[PDB]
Structures are given as C-alpha cells and as structure tokens.
Amino acid sequence: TKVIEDSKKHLIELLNIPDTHEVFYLQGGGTTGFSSVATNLAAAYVGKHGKIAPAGYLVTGSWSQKSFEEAKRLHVPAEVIFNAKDYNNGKFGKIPDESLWEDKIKGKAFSYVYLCENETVHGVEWPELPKCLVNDPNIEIVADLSSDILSRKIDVSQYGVIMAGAQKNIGLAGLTLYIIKKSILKNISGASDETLHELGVPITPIAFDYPTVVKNNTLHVMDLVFQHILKKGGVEAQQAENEEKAKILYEALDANSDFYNVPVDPKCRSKMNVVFTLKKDGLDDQFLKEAAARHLTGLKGHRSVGGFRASIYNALSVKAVQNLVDFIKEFAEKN
Amino acid sequence: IEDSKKHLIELLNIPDTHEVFYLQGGGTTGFSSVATNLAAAYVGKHGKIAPAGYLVTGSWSQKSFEEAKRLHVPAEVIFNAKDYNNGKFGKIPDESLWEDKIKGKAFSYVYLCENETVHGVEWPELPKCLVNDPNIEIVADLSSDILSRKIDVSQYGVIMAGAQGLAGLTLYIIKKSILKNISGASDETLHELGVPITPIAFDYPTVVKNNTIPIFTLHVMDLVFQHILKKGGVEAQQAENEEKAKILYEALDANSDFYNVPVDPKCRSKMNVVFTLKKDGLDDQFLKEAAARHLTGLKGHRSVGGFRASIYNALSVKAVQNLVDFIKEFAEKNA
C-alpha cells in the first residue's frame, strides 16, 4: 500500500521538483487532462486576483488544438494565441516565430497559457520554452510534456502545472501525472461563491478539484520505470540518447530527400515522433511489408494523416534505430 | 472484450429502450456527470432549461444535490426529510405533502436515492406521483440495492449504481431517448442558457459511442452476475436480503426497549440496520462482547455514532441469526 509515496520521491528526484511544487496523479491519461486543467486554473486566477482573464492556447498540433476546443466547449475564457495551421496553409508542421505573436501575450493578463511540448501525431516538438512566456511573471504556464516527461531536462520552476499522461483519446483509463505549483492550489481553494459564480467561471467537478485530489492522496508499475531511468543517468541521459536516435533517423531521410518527404520544418522537428512520406505513394505497402519482414514494426501513420511515423522511446536502442536507418536507406536506393 | 452487459441485461430485464454502460468512479463522479448530462438532455427536447429536483431522504441524495448546486446546474430540493423530524434523517414525508410540487413544476429530472446507507432509510416504493407524471424523468441511485431489489427499468430515465475518489466503477442504465437528446443539444444554446457542460470524458453519448475502461475487475462483474442469475435472479436475492433484515429488526424491536431504532418503520432499510443503545454507557462493552462471538463491522459511520448492521449478498442468514442472538443476549444480560 502507498508505494505512491515512493514513486513521488523518485519523480522529485529525477526531475528535481522543487518544494514549491507538488506531485499528484489523476486517473485519466487523456481528455481528463484538458478539462480539469482549464477549470481549475481559471479558478486559481479568480483566487489570486479577483476577476477572470482568458486562457491562452498555443496550437502547434492535434493535442494543443483539442485542449483549446475543450476549454471552449466548457466556456472557460480562452483564446487561440496562434494556430500553426494558419502559418503554413492549414497543415501543421511549423511553429511560428515568437515575434509574430509574442505581443498578443505581452502586457495582457491570462489565466494561463497552454502548450503541448511534443505533438505526437504531427511530429512537431517545441525547440524551447517560448521566452516571452518565461519572462512574464504573471503568466502561469501549463505544459503537456506527455511524450517527453522522462526524456527532456526541464526546469520545473518555470511551469505552473506540468501534465503528462498519454496523448490518446483513451477513456478514463491510464494516469496523468501532474506537477503543480502550491501557489496555484492554495488559490484554487481561495475562491468560491459569487466570485466564481457571478463571473461565469465553470466549476470543476470535485472528483477533479486539484486541491481535493491531493488531500485524498497497479502503480508500482511506473515506480519501477522511475527506478530504471534513475541510475541509468536520469532524464539528461535519456534525452541525449533519444536525441542521438533521432539525429540518425532524420539524416537518413534528409539524405534521400529524392525519395522521402519530411513535412515538418527542421526548427520544430520532434525527436520522439518522426513523420515522413514517400514521394511515390504507390509503394507504401511495399515499404510496410519489407519492414515487417525485418522485424521493424510500428510505422504506419495514424489512420487519419496517413504516411509513416517512427516513434522513439526510452526503451529503444540506438542499434534498433540504426536497423531502421538501414532499411530507409536501402529502400530508397532500391527504388 | 467481455460483454458483461449481456448478463446485467438478463439480470434486470433491461428493455431495448435503455443502454447499459459503465464509468470509472463511484462516489462523486456520478453526482457530477448525471446532473450536467441530464440538464443538457432537457435543452435537447426543449429550448429551455428547467431545475433539477432532489428528493433528499439521506446523506447521499443530500450530497448529490449539493454538488449540482456547486456546479450551477439549475436544481432544487423538493423535500428534505430532515425537516420532518427535527433535522434528523429517518423519515420520508408522505407524498401528499409534495406530490403537487412535483406535478406542477418543470423539472429536468427528479433525483432520489433508493437506499441511504448511512441512515438506513430506503424508499418503500418508487413514488406513485413520480411514475404517473409523464413529464418527469426519474434518476434513481440504487447503489446498495441494484442486485437485491426488483425494479422496472422502463420507469427510470437513469439507474446508476456504484458505492456510497475516482476509484471503483459506476454502472449506468440510461434511456436511449436521453442520450439522443444530450447529443441533440447545441452547445451554444447551453452557453446562453447558462447550463454547465460536462467534460467529454463523462459526456454520456460519447462514453457509449465506444468505451478505455479499467477492466480486470469487469470479469468479477459477470462473475457476481450469473451466480445471482442462477440463484433465481434478483428476486431470490431480494427475498433473501429481506429475510436477513426482518429477523434483525425483530431482535431490536422486540426488546423491553434497550435499543432505539430511529428510522420510521415505513422506510426502514433492508441493507443497513441502524440502531442505538438507550443507555449509551454500554456501547463499548457491546462491541467487545460481540467480538467475543466473532461479530465485527458494527460501529456507526464515525458521524451518526450508533451501530450499523450492513447486510449484503454474501452474509448468510446463519450469520445474521448469530447476530440476532447476541442482540436479544446482550439486552437481557444488561437489563
């Protein structure tokens, strides 16, 4: 019982979570993440100050977008600061430069700004925390590090709340991690009645009222994973290896630029999710089966955007990536 | 992928008008999602919002109402049984005194709780005023009775059963009508009407659209079914639990008044026998002398402060007979 306490200890270790933030887990792993973070962080604003302000969404891909549209559905005050789709013809793939939107943010008050660090379906990963949000002290950052939580050294002090579960519209199944500021929780409490109620701020169900979740306290499963990443260098190690894994993969595709298309702009190329397509779309299944033959599986793009997507994880070996690099390079010179 | 649904459908004769589905959470999760979902269902059929109405017979239906209020679902208590005996639960007012508050108002739904566990208050019957009113969708919580109380599923718009955090499972049998109508809301009419919106993870028409569901126990589910199916179904289980309770109450009722049974006979619960000692001094010896006969799990609820006798499906009549004997031995012993 309460191996929770140990896993939490592991997390505050590998991430160096400061005393200013608290770790809590939530049954949900997906959609549950959006709704609960929007309603709770709206209420945290109403606590700290006395009024409501809109929430800011940086839409860099599918998950970003869904997150915003759910804050819209719930009638949480929120606005799309930008939609990367609008800056390269309705398709994701770029992350507009700060200057083109940073002033939509500076000086204005926000309940929080949301972003999705790694956009799994489209292979858009933020190169950096936008510096315009970092320098503003009255903008709380909500980040979804769903893909990179244990593979990208981040500074937990800069974040209002960190979310990591999956990036799948699964049910209530799975778990979402949370690392939230204690400032925020105190302020979620310090607000009710007319304040939240005449302002129209939607009330979060108590099942998901963040302060009540920490007060109410099959999960050894992750405490195990936390332990293997520990010792083996921690997050910084796993980052450096995932980075290396991707460098090799991308070079193979860039090299045979005659044969493949990498549709995501290099600046925001995801290291966990590599997305590419064949210029001759009549050889996809030939590609899929030859790869099947080589025990290199899990490459068909999600059945929406199509094409191909090679996912990199902490458990993957550099030599297993190099096996795929070998096939990619061989298939292009073959055709 | 086990359709434990099929055995529930057989267990309760669930008609084709209704759909079984499950949700993770028990406890509060059911309060929250049923109120905003069913409020939306009203904006489906009609253009407007009507208040939800709550029949507060004990602590659980009280807490449902209080959460709907917190959430800003339009909702009102039709009665509160506490008012009809000195602010103490234990009674259900004659429907004469509230019939017309039902029949002459517009309600999204009317909520009642079949069995209030903490106070041992159970509805003798589904209220005839609710059933005759064609404009009232009944939302019933049979959380301690779903398998020991024969009911007519067609009389209900929502039957929900769990227990009384995010843990456990809440079971749902819902009119297909209601589902079509929560899908048939506009989302914009709901913003204007001020109706709070349920997070899509708990949006009933999507929860039924596909799923995932934390399982492994879902096997235990049809396990508990099927047995009951082959014991003679819910009717047999009901007759049995009735027997266990009738011999228990006879032991309390037939004393020279050594014990108090606070629940009115009209509305005494078959699953939770609440009782108390006329001379409170002896309540500590009561529990020791009971452990001396291997009878445990008998102390109040930390709030009410008397003694509870929670009858369930497993509890043998022999076991309640032993308890009957210890009640009858202790009252004579300590005359």
Numbering used by the authors:
A (entry chain B): 51 to 267, 277 to 394
B (entry chain A): 54 to 217, 221 to 267, 272 to 395
Q: What does the literature reporting this entry say, word for word?
A:
Phosphoserine aminotransferase (PSAT) is a pyridoxal 5′-phosphate-dependent enzyme involved in the second step of the phosphorylated pathway of serine biosynthesis. PSAT catalyzes the transamination of 3-phosphohydroxypyruvate to 3-phosphoserine using L-glutamate as the amino donor. The pyridoxal-5′-phosphate (PLP)-dependent transamination reaction catalyzed by PSAT, which necessitates a lysine residue in the active site, has two reversible half-reactions. In yeast S. cerevisiae, the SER1 gene encodes PSAT and yeast cells supported by fermentable carbon sources, mainly by the glycolytic pathway, to synthesize serine and glycine.
